[PDB]
Amino acid sequence: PTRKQKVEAQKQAEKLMKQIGVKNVKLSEYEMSIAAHLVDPLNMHVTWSDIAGLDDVITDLKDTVILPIKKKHLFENSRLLQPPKGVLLYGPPGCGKTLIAKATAKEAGCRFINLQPSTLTDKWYGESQKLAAAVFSLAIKLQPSIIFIDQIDSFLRNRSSSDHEATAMMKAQFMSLWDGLDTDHSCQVIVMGATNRPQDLDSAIMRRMPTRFHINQPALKQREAILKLILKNENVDRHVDLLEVAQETDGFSGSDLKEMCRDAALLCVREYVNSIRPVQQQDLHRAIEKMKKSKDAAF
Amino acid sequence: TRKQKVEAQKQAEKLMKQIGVKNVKLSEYEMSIAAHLVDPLNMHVTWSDIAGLDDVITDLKDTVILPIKKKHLFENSRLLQPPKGVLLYGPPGCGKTLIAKATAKEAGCRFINLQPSTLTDKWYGESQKLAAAVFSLAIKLQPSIIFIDQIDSFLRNRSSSDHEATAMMKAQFMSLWDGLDTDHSCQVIVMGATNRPQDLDSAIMRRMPTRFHINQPALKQREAILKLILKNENVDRHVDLLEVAQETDGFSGSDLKEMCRDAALLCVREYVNSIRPVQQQDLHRAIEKMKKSKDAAF
Amino acid sequence: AEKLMKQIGVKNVKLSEYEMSIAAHLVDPLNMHVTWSDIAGLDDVITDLKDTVILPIKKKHLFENSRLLQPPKGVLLYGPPGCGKTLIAKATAKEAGCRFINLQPSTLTDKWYGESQKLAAAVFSLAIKLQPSIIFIDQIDSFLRAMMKAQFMSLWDGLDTDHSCQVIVMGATNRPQDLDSAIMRRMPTRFHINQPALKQREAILKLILKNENVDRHVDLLEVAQETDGFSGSDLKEMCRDAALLCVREYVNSIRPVQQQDLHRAIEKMKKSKDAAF
Amino acid sequence: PTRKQKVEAQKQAEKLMKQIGVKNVKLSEYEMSIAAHLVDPLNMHVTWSDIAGLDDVITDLKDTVILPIKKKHLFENSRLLQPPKGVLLYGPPGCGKTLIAKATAKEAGCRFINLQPSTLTDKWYGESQKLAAAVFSLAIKLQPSIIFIDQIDSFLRNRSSSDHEATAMMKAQFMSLWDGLDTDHSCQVIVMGATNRPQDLDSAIMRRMPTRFHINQPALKQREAILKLILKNENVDRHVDLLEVAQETDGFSGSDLKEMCRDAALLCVREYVNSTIRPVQQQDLHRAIEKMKKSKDAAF
Amino acid sequence: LSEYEMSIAAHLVDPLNMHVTWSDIAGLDDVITDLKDTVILPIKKKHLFENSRLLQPPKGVLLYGPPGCGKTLIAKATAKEAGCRFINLQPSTLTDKWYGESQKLAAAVFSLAIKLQPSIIFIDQIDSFLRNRSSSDHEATAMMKAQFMSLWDGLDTDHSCQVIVMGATNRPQDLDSAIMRRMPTRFHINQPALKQREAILKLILKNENVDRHVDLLEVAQETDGFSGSDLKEMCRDAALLCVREYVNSIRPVQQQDLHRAIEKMKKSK
Amino acid sequence: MHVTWSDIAGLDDVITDLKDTVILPIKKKHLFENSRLLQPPKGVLLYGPPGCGKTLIAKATAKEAGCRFINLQPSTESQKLAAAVFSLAIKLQPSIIFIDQIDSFATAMMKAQFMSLWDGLDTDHSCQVIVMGATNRPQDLDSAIMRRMPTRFHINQPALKQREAILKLILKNENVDRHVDLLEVAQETDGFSGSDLKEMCRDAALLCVREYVNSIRPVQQQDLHRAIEKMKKSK
Ligand SMILES: Nc1ncnc2c1ncn2[C@@H]1O[C@H](COP(=O)(O)OP(=O)(O)OP(=O)(O)O)[C@@H](O)[C@H]1O
Ligand SMILES: Nc1ncnc2c1ncn2[C@@H]1O[C@H](COP(=O)(O)OP(=O)(O)OP(=O)(O)O)[C@@H](O)[C@H]1O
Ligand SMILES: Nc1ncnc2c1ncn2[C@@H]1O[C@H](COP(=O)(O)OP(=O)(O)OP(=O)(O)O)[C@@H](O)[C@H]1O
Ligand SMILES: Nc1ncnc2c1ncn2[C@@H]1O[C@H](COP(=O)(O)OP(=O)(O)OP(=O)(O)O)[C@@H](O)[C@H]1O
Ligand SMILES: Nc1ncnc2c1ncn2[C@@H]1O[C@H](COP(=O)(O)OP(=O)(O)OP(=O)(O)O)[C@@H](O)[C@H]1O
Ligand SMILES: [Mg+2]
Ligand SMILES: [Mg+2]
Ligand SMILES: [Mg+2]
Ligand SMILES: [Mg+2]
Known part of the structure; x- marks a missing residue:
């Protein structure tokens, strides 16, 4: 018959x-x-x-x-x-x-x-x-x-009158x-x-x-926890407290902090390639500032 | 050919x-x-x-x-x-x-x-x-x-955007x-x-x-369904189903079942950490949890 | 053939x-x-x-x-x-x-x-x-x-x-x-084929209950002036519900349908007709 | 069914x-x-x-x-x-x-x-x-x-309620x-x-x-940069003050300066053809800028 | 294809x-x-x-x-x-x-x-x-x-x-x-403004019937105030008046039919 | 044609x-x-x-x-x-x-x-x-x-006078009563469409025919009024 595209689901499942x-x-x-x-x-x-x-x-x-x-x-x-x-x-x-x-x-x-x-x-x-x-x-x-x-x-x-019959x-x-x-x-x-x-x-x-x-948006303690979890395996400077970063963010979600850490790591990699460098907690400030300036575009 | 009715003939x-x-x-x-x-x-x-x-x-x-x-x-x-x-x-x-x-x-x-x-x-x-x-x-x-x-x-409702077979x-x-x-x-x-x-x-x-x-349960209907649900499960003696029914004021016949299930789950969780009946204290906690969770639409 | x-x-x-x-x-x-x-x-x-x-x-x-x-x-x-x-x-x-x-x-x-x-x-x-x-x-x-x-x-x-x-x-x-x-x-x-008016409602109501043992003091004109919007099948369903309510007093243990049963059936049907609204 | 539209792209993809x-x-x-x-x-x-x-x-x-x-x-x-x-x-x-x-x-x-x-x-x-x-x-x-x-x-x-089910x-x-x-x-x-x-x-x-x-709207330095980039392949005279037109515009985007250069070149070709190759002497640019400003004003 | x-x-x-x-x-x-x-x-x-x-x-x-x-x-x-x-x-x-x-x-x-x-x-x-693009309009166009x-x-x-x-x-x-x-x-594309009206009037009256001498400069300021497309429709009224009058008894145009067409177009407004 | x-x-x-x-x-x-x-x-x-x-x-x-x-x-x-x-x-x-x-x-x-x-x-x-x-x-x-x-x-309904003229031109073909006039019917038609007058006259003729089949005579003003009332009830 027609619709015989199920010839590969049984050989796929x-x-x-x-x-x-x-x-x-x-x-x-x-x-x-x-x-x-x-x-x-x-x-x-x-x-x-x-x-x-x-x-x-x-x-x-x-x-x-x-x-x-x-x-x-x-x-x-x-x-x-x-x-x-x-x-x-x-x-x-x-x-x-x-x-x-x-x-x-x-x-x-x-x-x-x-x-x-x-x-x-x-x-x-x-x-x-x-x-x-x-x-x-x-x-x-x-x-x-x-x-x-x-x-x-x-x-x-939500069901309404403007819905297809099959759906x-x-x-x-x-x-x-x-x-x-x-x-x-x-x-x-x-x-x-x-x-x-x-x-x-x-x-x-x-x-x-x-x-x-x-699943609400991370608060101060939750932001500190996720910032400490993300910066666990990668090389970070010895004295870097995640409390001040989470307090400075004040509006970041669980995905924006991941992007901030990725941006800091990418900045470190770019600075290394231009000439392995740990995040000295100074790139985090400029990363937060750039992320805030980018997020301020929706307004 | 549509020769699958055979199996429908071996199931009917x-x-x-x-x-x-x-x-x-x-x-x-x-x-x-x-x-x-x-x-x-x-x-x-x-x-x-x-x-x-x-x-x-x-x-x-x-x-x-x-x-x-x-x-x-x-x-x-x-x-x-x-x-x-x-x-x-x-x-x-x-x-x-x-x-x-x-x-x-x-x-x-x-x-x-x-x-x-x-x-x-x-x-x-x-x-x-x-x-x-x-x-x-x-x-x-x-x-x-x-x-x-x-x-x-x-x-x-019959309209123009309908298939011929339907x-x-x-x-x-x-x-x-x-x-x-x-x-x-x-x-x-x-x-x-x-x-x-x-x-x-x-x-x-x-x-x-x-x-x-089949209307939404009122105070009397809420008390009735709360007394019917909490029948076989073990519960404390001095638990008045009228109090929780009057406090709820916003659940259907399915939300009270979920509240009782959550109370029983809290009891079995407090027991498994170390058979305990509900002392009407877990009921209020489950009611508050469900009331604070039902505000997702608003 | x-x-x-x-x-x-x-x-x-x-x-x-x-x-x-x-x-x-x-x-x-x-x-x-x-x-x-x-x-x-x-x-x-x-x-x-x-x-x-x-x-x-x-x-x-x-x-x-x-x-x-x-x-x-x-x-x-x-x-x-x-x-x-x-x-x-x-x-x-x-x-x-x-x-x-x-x-x-x-x-x-x-x-x-x-x-x-x-x-x-x-x-x-x-x-x-x-x-x-x-x-x-x-x-x-x-x-x-x-x-x-x-x-x-x-x-x-x-x-x-x-x-x-x-x-x-x-x-x-x-x-x-x-x-x-x-x-x-x-x-x-x-x-x-319009829906029954005040007179057609009374006509169809009088035609529905002819062979049944209805009471003598049942004026169908009052039922017609009380419905105010009932269709052809709605009146048949109301009469059926009235007959069931009248026989309910006997099946639990033949009673002539009075005006109270018809009024209760009309009220129930008017309450039920608000489902689409 | 719709297997025709999907049988042509197959021979094109x-x-x-x-x-x-x-x-x-x-x-x-x-x-x-x-x-x-x-x-x-x-x-x-x-x-x-x-x-x-x-x-x-x-x-x-x-x-x-x-x-x-x-x-x-x-x-x-x-x-x-x-x-x-x-x-x-x-x-x-x-x-x-x-x-x-x-x-x-x-x-x-x-x-x-x-x-x-x-x-x-x-x-x-x-x-x-x-x-x-x-x-x-x-x-x-x-x-x-x-x-x-x-x-x-x-x-x-943005997701809302007045949207089709498929989209x-x-x-x-x-x-x-x-x-x-x-x-x-x-x-x-x-x-x-x-x-x-x-x-x-x-x-x-x-x-x-x-x-x-x-990608912001070009500023003074950006406008000068794009005006110098555009006026590189076309035939132009020896001295062109790109800062002059850049400061003159003050509101032109990255596409409006391209249009101004195109209008200047078209004016040059029109002046050449009317007789029978002429480089822009930094005078058609000002006229084209004024014309573009008048056009943007008369649009409202 | x-x-x-x-x-x-x-x-x-x-x-x-x-x-x-x-x-x-x-x-x-x-x-x-x-x-x-x-x-x-x-x-x-x-x-x-x-x-x-x-x-x-x-x-x-x-x-x-x-x-x-x-x-x-x-x-x-x-x-x-x-x-x-x-x-x-x-x-x-x-x-x-x-x-x-x-x-x-x-x-x-x-x-x-x-x-x-x-x-x-x-x-x-x-x-x-x-x-102009917006978010309140129908999200299909x-x-x-x-x-x-x-x-x-x-x-x-x-x-x-x-x-x-x-x-x-x-x-x-x-x-x-x-x-x-x-x-x-x-x-x-602007409004004719007292000159392009006369120009298009002289243009449309070129390939037409006898069209006895009537200066378009005369009917230039007392003509239709705007909408040269209606000036194209104004000469149509003169043509229909010249072809509809002879059936009662080809007729050349003059200032009378043009003026009547102008008054009709003004009454239409 | x-x-x-x-x-x-x-x-x-x-x-x-x-x-x-x-x-x-x-x-x-x-x-x-x-x-x-x-x-x-x-x-x-x-x-x-x-x-x-x-x-x-x-x-x-x-x-x-x-x-x-x-x-x-x-x-x-x-x-x-x-x-x-x-x-x-x-x-x-x-x-x-x-x-x-x-x-x-292709179209x-x-x-x-x-x-x-x-x-x-x-x-x-x-x-x-x-x-x-x-x-x-x-x-x-x-x-x-x-x-x-x-x-x-x-091309829409011109006026009531045009409807009366159309009714007079269409009804003056068969046998009609002396007192029955198309103008008197159009005065009560109350703005019937062009094809509405023809169908009203057809309904009047059908009523006049059924008057003899139930028991041939010419159409009268009463039959025309009844047909107009039926057409208005069915409008
Ligand atoms: N608690 C957490 N621990 C580690 N990573 C997290 C945590 N919370 C969020 N993330 C980060 O968030 C990303 C996953 O986002 P996710 O896919 O959950 O978004 P979503 O909520 O599904 O989006 P939508 O709301 O549109 O469905 C991961 O890359 C992960 O690094
Ligand atoms: N009178 C009652 N006695 C006992 N349980 C009840 C009663 N009313 C509701 N329930 C509970 O409600 C649940 C059944 O819900 P049900 O399937 O009837 O919802 P529904 O009305 O079919 O939903 P939908 O309107 O979407 O079709 C059962 O689990 C049952 O425990
Ligand atoms: N004049 C009447 N006298 C007695 N009963 C009537 C009358 N009209 C309708 N009914 C009742 O209505 C029922 C039939 O409904 P009916 O055939 O009018 O629906 P319908 O209009 O055909 O439905 P649909 O619009 O889907 O075609 C019968 O059972 C009959 O008892
Ligand atoms: N930096 C630049 N260098 C060279 N040309 C440029 C530059 N910036 C803009 N242009 C000119 O702009 C034109 C491209 O415009 P583009 O298609 O990017 O507009 P757009 O921003 O995509 O429009 P929309 O926002 O509506 O999508 C090109 O023709 C190019 O000549
Ligand atoms: N200046 C003119 N010279 C010659 N003909 C003209 C002139 N102005 C108007 N017309 C005539 O008027 C008619 C309609 O004019 P035009 O094409 O300007 O309308 P339009 O604005 O294009 O209409 P739409 O907005 O519906 O496209 C044309 O067929 C044209 O022959
Ligand atoms: Mg997701
Ligand atoms: Mg169900
Ligand atoms: Mg039917
Ligand atoms: Mg683009």
Whole structure:
């Protein structure tokens, strides 16, 4: 027939499945096309120790998502002790969202799966809803599993009249398979999504993601912590305190400080090549000044 | 060729043996539609598990379940038959899917989930055949309850920016609902749960006249659901569910479940660091956490 | 063909395969318990439809030679959703004297090669073979908003000129504004099936409860003056809910429906009608 | 379906890929349709020497983008020394932006690719997101590469509610594939964009383009530099005071001085042809400046 | 030769059947002088100074002023005296009721213009098409009006193609800030102002009927106050009055019919 | 075309404007061929309300001026057929090419060839090949050749007196009552459209016929009033 571009998902999500260690899974063409976006747990290079600035959020996520997956002998006796069916990572953009997502993909346990909603929308009629169903079918087939939807503020957007029929049907099927009729059993299928704009997400999807973790912008202590974490392996001058830098920033996020340290290292490398030099804490001041002058362009 | 119905024919047979049908001869499309039949014994929720509202439950039981049984009493009257549509509308969360499961389990006749994703097909002239086979199967076994979850997305408001197959299916649904051959003594009822009935339709809205408003829980309903949830789990003796219900004032039927789950998780976390009941102190902390987290939209 | 010949009453069956497949689709006037007495409230529209379409079919001796009385090709019954359209169509299918046939465009779209123009030609060949015939396409808005569409349009425009076959295309419509630009013009006769007014509401309410054991002091005029916006199906649902509420006092352990049950049903229906707002 | 539009670019992207130097790259239909917009390195005829007026920006770009591409032995040990994942060239319209982009399309090494967001949007449903994914797929397939998004203040605009679902999905997928779950690894895939309205670009795309270069309106020294650069190939007299016209303009951008020089040359050719090669004697420049000022005044 | 290219080719005016020269445009003569040496001279005789990098015709010619009085007449005459392939489509031929069918249309237009020799492009009423960029407007034409700028002078442009785009507007104050940049040579088509009116009146009355002696200087200040296009429509009223009077009983014109046409045009206002 | 200019009543001023402008081609030489600006417009268009004598106006303009007419039939390779039709219409001079439903009518190459042929004909001859086939709704009909149709007239409801004249001209064909007058019916029609009076008279005749079929007589004022009331209720 037509649309036979699934001739390489089954040959692409099989060698990728052997890297995870699944023995006997009987899937269809749509299920394999969905599983073609599974992430390898060993392909990540960031653990919980690489995420600084916030500590209570890490422990909360670990005891809400990671803990109920293991120690099943203690959480299966009670009626309501299973992990939630949704984790909404909201807050300002930059620090925390994708890093916590990678930490959950690597060190959390059960098979992680990225959705990438671009593969759900198809050209042919009656093909996007089948893929949306195969998503949850594969999630149920692989217990447990964590369905990750990055930028969930666009795919599962607020419903209105100016929406395509296939996208609206997929958005309805998502909430009809989340906690629908034949769902809500002991399946350990959790759906998480990181988004910087949770104001216009939805009204029916917002309740299906009850555990909402606010990853705020780093404060003074958080900025000091992330500045001390970033300048750990690279050569830095012996007496360089990260408190004055974090106090001087006062508006930098977790990604702007990374750029500031990268700019300082690049300035040191350029000064060395013009003629291995450590950051004498003087380049940090001019880097902060240049970054502030650049950020002042939005106003 | 679309020769996958074979597997849909090997999944709509064993399930049939789980329901107890003896002689029902169907076609390929009818079998593919019946492949979504729900097992009544697979549900684990009855009318006793739905608290907070009682008049709505009694109304639904006397409107849907009561006409199904005692057919000798309603066979003489002309307008004493079950309706052809039940629209469960209201705010999202509490009541809709729970009442759907209760009607699937403890209501009687064979329940069927539509799952409109299977109606839309890639091949031309295949979605309308499945839409017809839906009602064909519904009439084939009487009675039956056709459930369409989130019906405000499949039978949307008819406009010009709609595909030919979807528009044809939406027209065939209302043509086979109360058209030229239906509306006889068939006892085929179609129900649907939705949280946005404002933009559902103009012709489908009248075909579902029995509309049950599953409102958002009030003080009494909040206390009722809080007492129902905290029933089997261990809790302190002097814990008044009225206090937390009056303090909340802003949760639906699903947010209180999350609050109780968070309280139990806090208890089991404080225990696992070194079985502890909730002393009504973790309840307030979970309520404050959920109230400070629900401000993400604003 | 022969499987459904029991009602056409003509031994002129020379149908082919497509004609045979289309012949299994005409309506069954036997199991149609609807006449002009069943439809209430709108009697002027009924008599208009009658003296416009019906006598051109039954009266076949006065106009026989050439006379101007002709069945208008294309009758569009348009209005709000409910209250009359399919009921009038079914009454016509019952007692129009002609072979009524339903379309249901879902059967036209064949999967093989996407060729659905052959069926669009076969349906018209069948309608002309056993004239008079009324081709009814329910929900004609979604069906006509594309080789089959042009072929069917040209067929309907070209074959209905010899005034030898009384084939008439009739359609019901709840959204007449977005129907079409040429189809709306192609149908000369348009019947506006309005929603029941203060008098039509009372008429249909009195017609709904006739054989039931209703109380003596139940003035339907008060119910009509209390509804103020109820459609045809809404009043039937209200009466059904009132009957269920009256029988609820007996099933829990035959009671005549009083005014209190009707008032409670009206209040419940008016509260429920605010779902779309 | 739409396999025709994707069967022509396939016969066009291959030839353009033959002269670039990609040896073995296996692409799909969407990847080939995206690669069909690759720019030829030899077609660009503007280098760093042809861009005057700004000097610190040039060396900053050479150290930030051009330097980490080569000499990989120095930036392979540390954790954060790779080239950035975005270069936002913001400033008033005129000088710098498109010229710097054209210069980097030739004198940067790695394969340059223009996005041309007009080809991303498609008529069929579920086709624009596939092309947006194929963009980054092709970028990762050949390393390194520079994805240029001209006038990025329109495609990756500020997210709101009055936007189409396809453009919103594409805008979300761009930032999801920029620094998402499987793209933070070292891949040398850099995305740059030139725009004249950075105030309403975005809140999540702005952080993904940390290196923000401001191309200001030419000042006195910059105006003198560009006026001396432009009046180098054309025939001019011996003595030309470039500071005079530079101080006279006081409001001309990098493109208005080019127009003034063109108008002076056209006046010279008109005076020559009217009789039947004449060098500008620093008098047609003042008249052209006055005419350009009168034209800019009468525009309102 | 794509599909959108062939769809655009339906608006490509043939360079042979134009029959519009500088003689048809009377009245204003200063704008014609500055446009001949700036647009026609660099386009033609390219074998003289092709070595120079900035001796090419400007790609941003724009003619503003009141509506009418020779706006597109100068464009057609220029394109006829220029190389070939006058290309005007519409102010609203684009913006089809689809998704991704408006920017691709402009892309096809520009590709077709690049395919052949300069092929002067004329965009009638660029004021509303390329209006000032903002964030409150519908976010479907802003991306299009930005792609137009990105394709006008971008990466692949600035070659020896001579592709010159010509615009037209009635109020170039809210047009743009980056589009006016690539439009450096902007001519000012003014109002006739008591002289060009008489000139165009003497021009139009040349190839016509008998037209007995009536000095155009007489009806020069008591004529239509503006809109020379209505002066083109004013002589039409005299012609219809001269051809509609003889049916009651070819007739030569005089001051009476012209004055009555003037009074009728004034009453129309 | 069997239509007559005197039969179609209504806007008498528009009729004279047509019989002057469009029939300047019917006028001999030295009147429209001598002056360059006195020639009639090339490619006249017609737009306005739906129906109301859309094709009837073109038929009357072709019959009164005696100009040759030919049906374009846009519903019935395409570019070649269009070029052949244009050549056939331009050969037999003078001739008018009338099209049906031009508002919704390779097609682009055919339109470009037709526009080029019309431009060449106008540059060669004054009014040899005319084109009058534009339908209603010309605001967004098409954008193929805008300069081809620069002349048009908004044919709408002229006035109540024109409606009364049309009713008197259309009703004076069958048997009518003495007291029943078309002016008395138009005084109560309250601004009915052009095609509305014909359908109202048809409904009155159908009522008068049904009066005998239910039990032939001439139409009366009561039947006309009932038909007008039914048309207003159905309007
Ligand atoms: N706690 C942290 N420890 C180390 N690095 C951090 C931390 N927080 C942020 N970062 C830096 O931020 C970058 C990741 O940003 P990320 O991808 O999470 O943005 P995002 O929040 O996903 O963007 P958006 O809000 O648009 O989705 C990494 O390069 C990392 O160096
Ligand atoms: N009366 C009740 N008794 C017990 N639990 C309840 C009650 N009402 C709601 N719940 C809780 O709500 C959850 C079910 O939510 P449900 O699936 O009905 O949401 P929904 O209304 O279907 O959402 P949407 O409106 O988006 O379709 C269950 O987990 C259940 O614990
Ligand atoms: N005049 C009437 N008298 C009695 N019952 C009526 C009348 N009109 C409508 N009904 C009731 O309405 C129901 C039929 O609805 P109806 O056929 O009018 O809907 P419809 O207009 O065909 O729907 P759609 O607009 O989708 O075609 C019947 O069950 C009948 O009981
Ligand atoms: N430093 C320079 N050296 C030489 N030429 C220059 C310089 N700066 C600007 N120019 C001139 O400017 C023109 C390029 O303008 P460009 O396309 O960069 O405008 P832009 O800023 O991209 O416009 P927009 O902001 O609308 O995208 C070239 O023709 C070039 O001659
Ligand atoms: N000075 C003039 N000399 C000769 N003809 C003129 C003159 N001014 C106007 N006309 C005539 O008036 C007509 C319309 O004038 P013009 O082309 O200036 O309008 P326009 O502003 O281009 O209209 P639009 O804005 O719709 O494009 C032309 O056909 C032209 O023949
Ligand atoms: Mg992210
Ligand atoms: Mg639900
Ligand atoms: Mg109906
Ligand atoms: Mg630019």
